[PDB]
Paper text:
D2 also features disease-linked mutations in the region constituting the core of D2-NT fibrils. Notably, the most commonly reported pathogenic D2 mutation p.T61I33 occurs at a position facing the interior of the D2 PF fold, suggesting that this mutation, too, could promote alternative fibril structures. To assess this, we solved the structure of T61I D2-NT fibrils to 3.09 Å resolution. These fibrils featured a novel PF fold, consisting of residues G54–G87, that differs from the WT D2-NT fold, all three WT D10-NT folds, and the S59L D10-NT fold. In addition, the T61I PF fold appears to contain several LARKS (low complexity aromatic-linked kinked segments), likely stemming from three glycine-aromatic dipeptides (G59–H60, G63–H64, and G69–F70). Unlike the case of S59L, the T61I mutation does not flip the larger isoleucine sidechain to the PF fold exterior. However, the two valines in the VAV motif, which are found at the PF interface in all other protofilament structures we have observed, are flipped towards the PF interior in the T61I fold. In contrast, the aggregation rates of the T61I D2 mutant did not result in substantial alteration of the aggregation kinetics of D2-NT or appreciable signal loss in NMR spectra. However, the T61I mutation in D2, which also incorporates a large hydrophobic residue, did not result in substantial changes to the aggregation kinetics of the protein or in appreciable signal loss in NMR spectra, indicating that other factors beyond hydrophobicity influence aggregation kinetics.
Mitochondrial proteins CHCHD10 and CHCHD2 are mutated in rare cases of heritable FTD, ALS and PD and aggregate in tissues affected by these diseases. Here, we demonstrate that the low complexity N-terminal domains of both D10 and D2, as well as the full-length proteins, can form amyloid fibrils in vitro and in vivo. Structures of D10 and D2 fibrils assembled in vitro from the low complexity N-terminal domains of each protein show that their core comprises the most highly conserved region between the two proteins. For D10 and D2, the central conserved VAV motif forms a beta-strand that is associated with the protofilament interface in all the structures we have observed, suggesting that it may be a critical element in fibril formation and may be expected to appear in ex vivo structures as well.
Author numbering:
A (entry chain H), B (entry chain G), C (entry chain F), D (entry chain L), E (entry chain K), F (entry chain J), ...: 54 to 87
């Protein structure tokens, strides 16, 4: 029984082009993870 | 019995082009994950 | 018995072009996940 | 017996073009997921 | 016996073009999922 | 015996063009899913 | 039973080109991880 | 039962080109990890 | 049961070219790791 | 002005079960394609 | 003006089960493609 | 103007199970491709 | 103007299970590719 | 103008299980590639 | 204008399990590549 | 204009398990590469 | 214009386990490379 | 214009475990490289 607060599971990834945010956390301001 | 607060499961991914946010968390402001 | 608060399961993904938000969380303001 | 608060299951995905929000959560304001 | 609060099951997806919201949650205001 | 609060099951999907909301939840205001 | 506050699991990654943020944490402002 | 505050697990990585932030922490401002 | 405050685990890495920040911590301002 | 000697264009495909020949060429004997 | 001697274009494919030949060339005997 | 003697273009592929020949060339005997 | 004697282009591939020949050339006997 | 005698282009590959031949050349007998 | 007698181009590969031949040349008998 | 008699180009490779032949040449008998 | 009689180009390789032949030449019998 | 009779180019290699032949030449019998 595993837990993931933020999970992005992509086994096969092939990106020809990606301008800007890509598969990440663009967090701004606040985030209460405690 | 696993739990995922934010899950994006994409086994086969092939992106020709993606300008801007792509498969991520563009979180702004607040998020209570505790 | 697994649980997913936010689940986007896409086995085969092929995106020719995607300008803007794509398969993500554009969360703004608040979100009570506790 | 699995549970999914937000589920978008799309086995075969092929997007020629998608400008704007696409297969995601454009959540603004509030969301009580606790 | 599985449960899905929000389910969009589309096995074969082929989108030539989709401007705007597409196969997602454009949630604004509030949502009591607890 | 499965249950789906919001179910949109479309096996074969082929969208030539779709401007605006498409196969999603344009929820505004409130929704009591608890 | 493992836990991941921020998890991005991508087994096979092949990026032809990616200008800007890519598979990371662009955190600005604050983040309460304690 | 392992825990990862920030985890980016990518077994096979092959980047043809990546200008800018790539698979890292572009943290600015503050971050409470204690 | 191991813990990693900042973990970037990439078994196989092959970077053809990467101009700028790459697989690191571009921390500016503050970070409370105590 | 494109030409296709054998064309089977099916944008959205969802096959629950298919025992035997399925969406292919079961060519036996001869075929003069020159 | 492209040409395809044998073309099977299926953008979105989702096969639950397929016993036997599936989306291929079961060529036996001869085929003059010169 | 491209040409493909044998083309099977399937952007999004998701195969739950496939016993036997699947998306290939089961060529036996002869084939004149010169 | 590219040419492919045997082309199987599948951008997004996700195979749950495949016993036997899968996305290949099971060539037996002869094949004149000169 | 490139040429490929045997081409199997699969950008995003994710194989859960594959017993037997998989994405290869099971050539037996003869093959005239000169 | 490049040429490939045997080409298997798979950008993103993620194999959970593969018993037997996998992405190779199981050539037996003869092959005239001169 | 490069040439490859046997080419298997896989940028991102992640193999959980592979018993037997894997991404190689199991050549037996003869092969005329001169 | 380079030539490769036997080429296996895999930029990012991550093998969890591989019992038996793996990314090599299991040549037995004969091979005419002159 | 370089030539490689046997080339296995793997930039990033990370092998957790590999019992048996691994990234080599298990040549038995004969090989005419002159």
């Amino acid at each position: 029984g595993l837990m993931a607060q933020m999970a992005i599971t992509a086994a096969g990834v092939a990106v020809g082009s990606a301008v800007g945010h890509t598969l990440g956390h663009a967090i701004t301001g606040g985030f209460s993870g405690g």
